[PDB]
Design a protein around this motif. Structure first.
Motif, PDB file in Angstrom:
ATOM      1  N   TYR A 104       0.842  -1.187   0.000  1.00 11.75           N
ATOM      2  CA  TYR A 104       0.000   0.000   0.000  1.00 11.75           C
ATOM      3  C   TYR A 104       0.883   1.245   0.000  1.00 11.75           C
ATOM      4  N   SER A 105       0.698   2.137  -0.968  1.00 17.04           N
ATOM      5  CA  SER A 105       1.498   3.358  -1.005  1.00 17.04           C
ATOM      6  C   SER A 105       0.567   4.555  -0.833  1.00 17.04           C
ATOM      7  N   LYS A 106       0.400   5.017   0.403  1.00 16.45           N
ATOM      8  CA  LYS A 106      -0.531   6.112   0.683  1.00 16.45           C
ATOM      9  C   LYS A 106      -0.176   7.538   0.287  1.00 16.45           C
ATOM     10  N   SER A 107      -1.156   8.176  -0.339  1.00 15.00           N
ATOM     11  CA  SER A 107      -1.077   9.558  -0.807  1.00 15.00           C
ATOM     12  C   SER A 107      -1.649  10.444   0.289  1.00 15.00           C
ATOM     13  N   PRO A 108      -1.262  11.721   0.304  1.00 15.58           N
ATOM     14  CA  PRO A 108      -1.750  12.675   1.299  1.00 15.58           C
ATOM     15  C   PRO A 108      -3.269  12.724   1.252  1.00 15.58           C
ATOM     16  N   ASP A 109      -3.810  12.530   0.053  1.00 15.58           N
ATOM     17  CA  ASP A 109      -5.245  12.565  -0.141  1.00 15.58           C
ATOM     18  C   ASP A 109      -5.921  11.226  -0.147  1.00 15.58           C
ATOM     19  N   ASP A 110      -5.288  10.252   0.492  1.00 10.03           N
ATOM     20  CA  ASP A 110      -5.824   8.907   0.551  1.00 10.03           C
ATOM     21  C   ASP A 110      -7.331   8.830   0.782  1.00 10.03           C
TER      22      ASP A 110
ATOM     23  N   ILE B 226      -4.096  27.170  -2.076  1.00  5.80           N
ATOM     24  CA  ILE B 226      -5.047  26.770  -1.068  1.00  5.80           C
ATOM     25  C   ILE B 226      -4.435  25.582  -0.327  1.00  5.80           C
ATOM     26  N   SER B 227      -4.160  25.776   0.961  1.00  3.28           N
ATOM     27  CA  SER B 227      -3.569  24.725   1.778  1.00  3.28           C
ATOM     28  C   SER B 227      -4.584  24.222   2.792  1.00  3.28           C
ATOM     29  N   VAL B 228      -4.625  22.910   3.015  1.00  2.93           N
ATOM     30  CA  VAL B 228      -5.585  22.381   3.962  1.00  2.93           C
ATOM     31  C   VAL B 228      -4.993  21.772   5.211  1.00  2.93           C
ATOM     32  N   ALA B 229      -5.789  21.907   6.278  1.00  3.28           N
ATOM     33  CA  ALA B 229      -5.523  21.418   7.621  1.00  3.28           C
ATOM     34  C   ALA B 229      -4.269  20.574   7.634  1.00  3.28           C
ATOM     35  N   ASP B 230      -4.434  19.266   7.772  1.00  2.00           N
ATOM     36  CA  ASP B 230      -3.273  18.400   7.817  1.00  2.00           C
ATOM     37  C   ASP B 230      -3.074  17.573   6.563  1.00  2.00           C
ATOM     38  N   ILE B 231      -3.401  18.134   5.404  1.00  2.04           N
ATOM     39  CA  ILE B 231      -3.209  17.393   4.163  1.00  2.04           C
ATOM     40  C   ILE B 231      -2.110  18.065   3.378  1.00  2.04           C
ATOM     41  N   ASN B 232      -1.029  17.327   3.150  1.00  2.00           N
ATOM     42  CA  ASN B 232       0.099  17.890   2.439  1.00  2.00           C
ATOM     43  C   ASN B 232       0.029  17.817   0.912  1.00  2.00           C
ATOM     44  N   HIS B 233      -0.964  18.485   0.344  1.00  2.00           N
ATOM     45  CA  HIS B 233      -1.092  18.526  -1.097  1.00  2.00           C
ATOM     46  C   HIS B 233      -1.881  19.780  -1.396  1.00  2.00           C
ATOM     47  N   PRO B 234      -1.179  20.904  -1.494  1.00  2.56           N
ATOM     48  CA  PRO B 234      -1.780  22.202  -1.783  1.00  2.56           C
ATOM     49  C   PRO B 234      -2.390  22.282  -3.187  1.00  2.56           C
ATOM     50  N   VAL B 235      -3.233  23.287  -3.383  1.00  2.00           N
ATOM     51  CA  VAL B 235      -3.912  23.512  -4.650  1.00  2.00           C
ATOM     52  C   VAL B 235      -3.751  24.978  -5.061  1.00  2.00           C
ATOM     53  N   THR B 236      -3.657  25.236  -6.363  1.00  5.81           N
ATOM     54  CA  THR B 236      -3.505  26.590  -6.889  1.00  5.81           C
ATOM     55  C   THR B 236      -4.836  27.115  -7.511  1.00  5.81           C
ATOM     56  N   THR B 237      -4.923  28.417  -7.832  1.00 10.10           N
ATOM     57  CA  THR B 237      -6.146  29.031  -8.425  1.00 10.10           C
ATOM     58  C   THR B 237      -5.989  29.388  -9.899  1.00 10.10           C
ATOM     59  N   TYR B 238      -7.091  29.434 -10.647  1.00 12.81           N
ATOM     60  CA  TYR B 238      -6.942  29.781 -12.056  1.00 12.81           C
ATOM     61  C   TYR B 238      -6.910  31.302 -12.288  1.00 12.81           C
ATOM     62  N   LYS B 239      -7.079  31.709 -13.550  1.00 10.63           N
ATOM     63  CA  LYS B 239      -7.069  33.116 -13.988  1.00 10.63           C
ATOM     64  C   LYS B 239      -8.082  34.054 -13.290  1.00 10.63           C
ATOM     65  N   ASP B 240      -9.237  33.518 -12.886  1.00  9.50           N
ATOM     66  CA  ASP B 240     -10.263  34.305 -12.188  1.00  9.50           C
ATOM     67  C   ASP B 240     -10.124  34.097 -10.685  1.00  9.50           C
ATOM     68  N   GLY B 241      -8.979  33.555 -10.276  1.00  8.99           N
ATOM     69  CA  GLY B 241      -8.735  33.300  -8.872  1.00  8.99           C
ATOM     70  C   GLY B 241      -9.647  32.230  -8.304  1.00  8.99           C
ATOM     71  N   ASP B 242     -10.357  31.510  -9.166  1.00  8.93           N
ATOM     72  CA  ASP B 242     -11.236  30.452  -8.684  1.00  8.93           C
ATOM     73  C   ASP B 242     -10.393  29.232  -8.341  1.00  8.93           C
ATOM     74  N   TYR B 243     -10.851  28.470  -7.347  1.00  9.75           N
ATOM     75  CA  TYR B 243     -10.160  27.255  -6.909  1.00  9.75           C
ATOM     76  C   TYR B 243     -11.184  26.184  -6.569  1.00  9.75           C
TER      77      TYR B 243
ATOM     78  N   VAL C 263     -13.403  15.324   1.938  1.00 10.95           N
ATOM     79  CA  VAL C 263     -14.415  14.471   2.512  1.00 10.95           C
ATOM     80  C   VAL C 263     -15.170  15.171   3.645  1.00 10.95           C
ATOM     81  N   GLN C 264     -16.352  14.659   3.955  1.00  5.70           N
ATOM     82  CA  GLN C 264     -17.147  15.206   5.031  1.00  5.70           C
ATOM     83  C   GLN C 264     -16.245  15.240   6.275  1.00  5.70           C
ATOM     84  N   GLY C 265     -16.080  16.432   6.851  1.00  7.65           N
ATOM     85  CA  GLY C 265     -15.259  16.626   8.041  1.00  7.65           C
ATOM     86  C   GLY C 265     -14.940  18.110   8.174  1.00  7.65           C
ATOM     87  N   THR C 266     -14.321  18.536   9.276  1.00  5.61           N
ATOM     88  CA  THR C 266     -13.988  19.960   9.461  1.00  5.61           C
ATOM     89  C   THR C 266     -12.510  20.276   9.166  1.00  5.61           C
TER      90      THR C 266
END
Ligand SMILES: *[C@@H]1O[C@H](CO)[C@@H](O[C@@H]2O[C@H](CO)[C@@H](O[C@@H]3O[C@H](CO)[C@@H](O)[C@H](O)[C@@H]3O)[C@H](O)[C@H]2NC(C)=O)[C@H](O)[C@H]1NC(C)=O
Ligand SMILES: *[C@@H]1O[C@H](CO)[C@@H](O[C@@H]2O[C@H](CO)[C@@H](O[C@@H]3O[C@H](CO)[C@@H](O)[C@H](O)[C@@H]3O)[C@H](O)[C@H]2NC(C)=O)[C@H](O)[C@H]1NC(C)=O
Ligand SMILES: *[C@@H]1O[C@H](CO)[C@@H](O[C@@H]2O[C@H](CO)[C@@H](O[C@@H]3O[C@H](CO)[C@@H](O)[C@H](O)[C@@H]3O)[C@H](O)[C@H]2NC(C)=O)[C@H](O)[C@H]1NC(C)=O
Ligand SMILES: *[C@H]1O[C@H](CO)[C@@H](O[C@@H]2O[C@H](CO)[C@@H](O[C@H]3O[C@H](CO)[C@@H](O)[C@H](O)[C@@H]3O)[C@H](O)[C@H]2NC(C)=O)[C@H](O)[C@H]1NC(C)=O
Ligand SMILES: *[C@H]1O[C@H](CO)[C@@H](O[C@@H]2O[C@H](CO)[C@@H](O[C@H]3O[C@H](CO)[C@@H](O)[C@H](O)[C@@H]3O)[C@H](O)[C@H]2NC(C)=O)[C@H](O)[C@H]1NC(C)=O
Ligand SMILES: *[C@H]1O[C@H](CO)[C@@H](O[C@@H]2O[C@H](CO)[C@@H](O[C@H]3O[C@H](CO)[C@@H](O)[C@H](O)[C@@H]3O)[C@H](O)[C@H]2NC(C)=O)[C@H](O)[C@H]1NC(C)=O
Ligand SMILES: *[C@@H]1O[C@H](CO)[C@@H](O[C@@H]2O[C@H](CO)[C@@H](O)[C@H](O)[C@H]2NC(C)=O)[C@H](O)[C@H]1NC(C)=O
Ligand SMILES: *[C@@H]1O[C@H](CO)[C@@H](O[C@@H]2O[C@H](CO)[C@@H](O)[C@H](O)[C@H]2NC(C)=O)[C@H](O)[C@H]1NC(C)=O
Ligand SMILES: *[C@@H]1O[C@H](CO)[C@@H](O[C@@H]2O[C@H](CO)[C@@H](O)[C@H](O)[C@H]2NC(C)=O)[C@H](O)[C@H]1NC(C)=O
Ligand SMILES: [Zn+2]
Ligand SMILES: [Zn+2]
Ligand SMILES: [Zn+2]
Lengths: 380, 380, 380
Positions: free
Chosen positions: B198-204, B321-338, B343-346
């Protein structure tokens, strides 16, 4: 401040196609990618239109074109034009200069007129000829109808494709790129005698101005010495040369433009090393970027306006703009708009037109930008 | 009530081109057909965009993509995606579900990433390999840059074409299709040791949710047994499997997506029989239709919004866009949309941005749809 | 007054592509150039849409199509259609007739259905067959599903491409061009017995009218004698002939249209000399120009209108228009618009429709133009 390119590498057809499509897709509002025909070996002859109004010729908006890689092994051009497509698309909106350019001009870029030839070329080739000719082995720059010599090589598809294209749009200024020397070569390319002697065009003055606009910006070119140790006999004052005087070229695309369309084209030699190693690429861009830019702007200089039909109040199509003592008239497009390149000085322009009565205004072109001049013509 | 497809047959390139163009022409208001490059053997790498606004990425509208037939002889995918193009175009307007989907999402479908391979394949082939590789004989799913192993096979045109494409649009969710098994395989596909572990991803977590969304709907897949009498050693609880744990795959396209773009991609094995007889085709559609549908909807779940520049009041480009304890950030497009799948959780999201001051809001994602969250950032 | 064509020469694929693209680019507001598939040898099957609204089918606007060069060595068609593309694009706006036509009709022109065949043909060929068949050597005009004989030649890509195309748009009238004779041939092309006997279609009357509309305008054709010294046995009263009666043709494209779409197609033989020398070309245009024109106009004659759903007040899709005693019903497009060709006389049309209650109005078609008739249907 402006964003420089990064994709500095030799792009074979496959990747050039990819590169091109990526930009066509990422900036659909500023670009329009199309083909103009197919090389002998069926490779698309791509062109990237870059306007803030892709696809349409708006009235009074000058049409410009850059063409590269006519000779397969002369690679620098191809890459620089790609670098340009990038640079333009990336800075549009962000950068003031680029934004202004893309808005005021309808730019058309063809990175490779001879893609078949390219594929048969050898990286590192400095003065060789492998891949120079097209797939059937004809010099695409000897393939056009010449005004003095009578061309014999059969018309090639890349040639025909391009000729048609030169007829399809109201191209005002243009420059096709080369390698094998460092100088911007202008008309005429040959002479009645077919020898290396100065062959002056009616528009000699403007051409010298145009060629200089580019060479002045490429430092080492402006110096006049292309490569002292290879071809040590070459010396071009300020990096520009009348084509014919450098050496007689019959059948070239450069003079064809002038003599068969309103477009004024210059031939630019970007360096003695035809196919340099990919590592040198970025340096070539850094040395020509301001040049490529400054050159396009010339498309705005001189005079321009419309030939309005006095009774309709609307543009006349294919009216003729004749200037003082320059024997090279210009025609108008569908909206009766016209563009005429000239140098700072005073002229006497005459709007001729079939079924109408000619008008002649005295115009004054100066050092900077272009002057707008409209000609309203009555019928008969 | 909704209209099912009818064109149930194996489509060779010629006909797939025809099929595709027919739909591009019949529903020009919903579709946009384009190529992304050419296979080694010069076959277009077609993609069918299906949006109620074909050609443009509108702000806040998630970009989705399905890719099939990466392996030439794994045919089920290719056909299902065609069936889908049809189903979507035909029910748009008539059917509420389809209409809603095409309006809220910008769907991109590529029925065959390896068309050359397909042509060399044999109908009836169940576990063979003839036509699997590309024209130069490389496994397009071992051809991508891997995070652990260092790929050696030269980059293929189909690969390059696709990589570029993954960069060209803000793809949020994706799934590439296969044959040879029945399970939806998720990241990571390999591990530092290159073994089946099993090779787990940050977003498992999200991945398991995504994979299940599809497998839950394909009955026989959900059962976990792909084909008891062929490959009797395979057992996938609920029809999903971490790639690496099933078997180490270095160089795949699936992990590349994740690691080099914001896109999250899963690999779907539609059945043990790679190239079944055309008669079985309709059954494959009946078994995957709800799956293909349900899967696309996942593109909406999680969180999304814009990163507005507080002084302009407009979108910032390439904010993080960085999340709580998930090490896989996300970037925004031309209109700054992301768009960020979760998953369901806080969670505790932080909008980072160069030249701006970071903001961190606590967000609450639940069982159903996605939550909209905007981040207004001040400068410095 | 109207501007005649000038590009009078044989156009090989390369140049035809160029020619076509030049017009697609020069008049982007009136044209839309597209492909419908690729010949066996991968040559695009180009079509030039010419409408004042290129790309869209507007409701109540009849769709028309001309197809040429199905048989490789029958060249006159190919060239005439190019001449037409030109003539239309050039006179639109300037000429009243052309402008009216392009506005009221959505014209689609395909200059060569068999480009591979063309390339293998010999200029000067008068009755030969070299290049007639397609690349795999099948007669594309024997390749369609026949109503009597059961076709055996495998379906060719050019055939499939075109069949699909005939399904893609609401084609009302059409004419595919040929060479080898001088007459306009109409349905049916064959008969249960497969012999040269008159084989009458339900729409015999309209067809005779349609065929005559064209032949009446081509002087030498109207005379009835194609070429007295070559094929001296041929005599066609007024230049038109029922196909089957001339000679049995099973598998043709002409009858396929009729029997599988709403389109009504006629086969036009432009002259006994299949591949005349380029010098004759202009004469062929001068002799067919008025014909080609007059023929298209027929697309407007008869009856047309919409099948509106009484509760919505909007068009019903795929309703059926049935006429008095003519056994060849017609269906409606997406906007419920329909077009039905008929001759001057009184009929009793019935708008049938699934889930609705049929209406029957008595209509009166006269000598001139077409009559508009709407059918509002209630549900059940
Ligand atoms: C690339 O293509 C060009 C043609 O566009 C080739 O140039 C042509 O080369 C031939 C061969 O020498 C020249 O013809 C010869 O001319 C001499 C001198 O008059 C004559 O004595 C020979 O009998 C023969 O006819 C031709 O003039 C020349 N054309 C041009 C425009 O320069 C060139 O050879 C090709 N390059 C390569 C590397 O193959
Ligand atoms: C389809 O293409 C893939 C490549 O993408 C081919 O896989 C490659 O197959 C070769 C041949 O065995 C493998 O190389 C060999 O590896 C062994 C083990 O280390 C070594 O002892 C040999 O000297 C040789 O180098 C290579 O690892 C493998 N690559 C991958 C990614 O699996 C495959 O053969 C092709 N399939 C067919 C049916 O041709
Ligand atoms: C162009 O392609 C067409 C096919 O679309 C070729 O026509 C076919 O020619 C063959 C050869 O004669 C015909 O088959 C033969 O029929 C006779 C009579 O029944 C039989 O005795 C032979 O054993 C053989 O089966 C076939 O009927 C005919 N098909 C059609 C639709 O006419 C044609 O030959 C090609 N033209 C050229 C110049 O190659
Ligand atoms: C010479 O002839 C040119 C041909 O028309 C003319 O261009 C027209 O210039 C006017 C005025 O600058 C423009 O006016 C339009 O736009 C303004 C708003 O910016 C409106 O208030 C007007 O009602 C009108 O819509 C025109 O757009 C422009 N072209 C046309 C077709 O009207 C030149 O300005 C003329 N003058 C000179 C000195 O060359
Ligand atoms: C967070 O930032 C988003 C970025 O703008 C924002 O989107 C904007 O939302 C407003 C209000 O829903 C939309 O308003 C426009 O349309 C309405 C009619 O539907 C008009 O009355 C308005 O005048 C205006 O034209 C915007 O279209 C939409 N995007 C933009 C660029 O304005 C989100 O709504 C923001 N709020 C949240 C909670 O995320
Ligand atoms: C039978 O049904 C046809 C289907 O609608 C109908 O076409 C509609 O005709 C009306 C009236 O000619 C058009 O009216 C529109 O345009 C005018 C301006 O030209 C406006 O004043 C109206 O408000 C309206 O926008 C419609 O465009 C046209 N199509 C539709 C969808 O409305 C035929 O006219 C009907 N009558 C007959 C005798 O066949
Ligand atoms: C545009 O203008 C020209 C002349 O103003 C029109 O007529 C001839 O066009 C040719 C073009 O090669 C010129 O060489 C001639 O000098 C013109 N005069 C005559 C008597 O031929 C021409 O028809 C118009 N259209 C084009 C495309 O040029
Ligand atoms: C978008 O953002 C990144 C970082 O937020 C910008 O800068 C670097 O981008 C690379 C992309 O591979 C990241 O790996 C680095 O972490 C970023 N920081 C540094 C110091 O390099 C990047 O320029 C922006 N554009 C893109 C396309 O990523
Ligand atoms: C349009 O109408 C037809 C009939 O009005 C619909 O149903 C059948 O369509 C086929 C088409 O080949 C006809 O041959 C049949 O007569 C029709 N009836 C039956 C019972 O099959 C058809 O579904 C509609 N769509 C199309 C494309 O024809
Ligand atoms: Zn050169
Ligand atoms: Zn696979
Ligand atoms: Zn024929």
């Amino acid at each position: 401040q402006a964003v420089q390119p990064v994709d500095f590498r030799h792009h074979h057809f496959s990747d050039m196609e990819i590169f091109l499509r990526r930009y066509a897709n990422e900036y659909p509002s500023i670009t329009r990618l199309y083909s103009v025909g197919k090389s002998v070996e069926l490779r698309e002859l791509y062109v990237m239109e870059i306007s803030d109004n892709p696809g349409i010729h708006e009235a009074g908006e000058p049409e410009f074109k850059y063409i590269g890689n006519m000779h397969g092994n002369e690679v620098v051009g191809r890459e620089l034009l790609l670098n340009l497509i990038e640079y333009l698309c990336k800075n549009f909106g962000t950068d003031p200069e680029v934004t202004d350019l893309v808005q005021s001009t309808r730019i058309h870029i063809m990175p490779s007129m001879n893609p078949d030839g390219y594929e048969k070329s050898q990286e590192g080739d400095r003065g060789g000829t492998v891949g120079r000719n097209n797939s059937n082995n004809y010099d695409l720059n000897r393939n056009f109808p010449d005004q003095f010599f009578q061309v014999t090589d059969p018309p090639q598809p890349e040639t025909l494709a391009v000729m048609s294209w030169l007829k399809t749009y109201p191209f005002v200024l243009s420059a096709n790129l080369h390698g094998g020397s460092l100088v911007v070569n202008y008309p005429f390319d040959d002479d009645e005698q077919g020898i290396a002697i100065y062959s002056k065009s009616p528009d000699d003055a403007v051409f010298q101005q145009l060629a200089l606009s580019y060479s002045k910006e490429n430092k080492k070119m402006y110096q006049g010495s292309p490569c002292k140790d290879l071809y040590p006999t070459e010396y071009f004052p300020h990096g520009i040369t009348n084509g014919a005087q450098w050496y007689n070229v019959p059948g070239g695309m450069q003079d064809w433009n002038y003599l068969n369309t309103n477009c004024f084209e210059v031939t630019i030699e970007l360096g003695c090393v035809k196919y340099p190693k990919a590592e040198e690429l970025p340096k070539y861009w850094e040395q020509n970027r301001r040049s490529l830019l400054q050159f396009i702007k010339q498309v705005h200089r001189g005079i321009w306006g419309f030939v309005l039909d006095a009774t309709d109040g609307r543009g006349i199509l294919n009216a003729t703009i004749s200037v003082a003592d320059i024997n090279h008239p210009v025609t108008t497009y569908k909206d009766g708009d016209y563009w005429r390149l000239l140098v700072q000085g005073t002229y006497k322009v005459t709007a001729s037109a079939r079924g109408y009565d000619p008008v002649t205004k005295t115009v004054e072109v100066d050092s900077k930008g272009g002057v707008q001049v409209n000609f309203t013509l009555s019928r008969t």
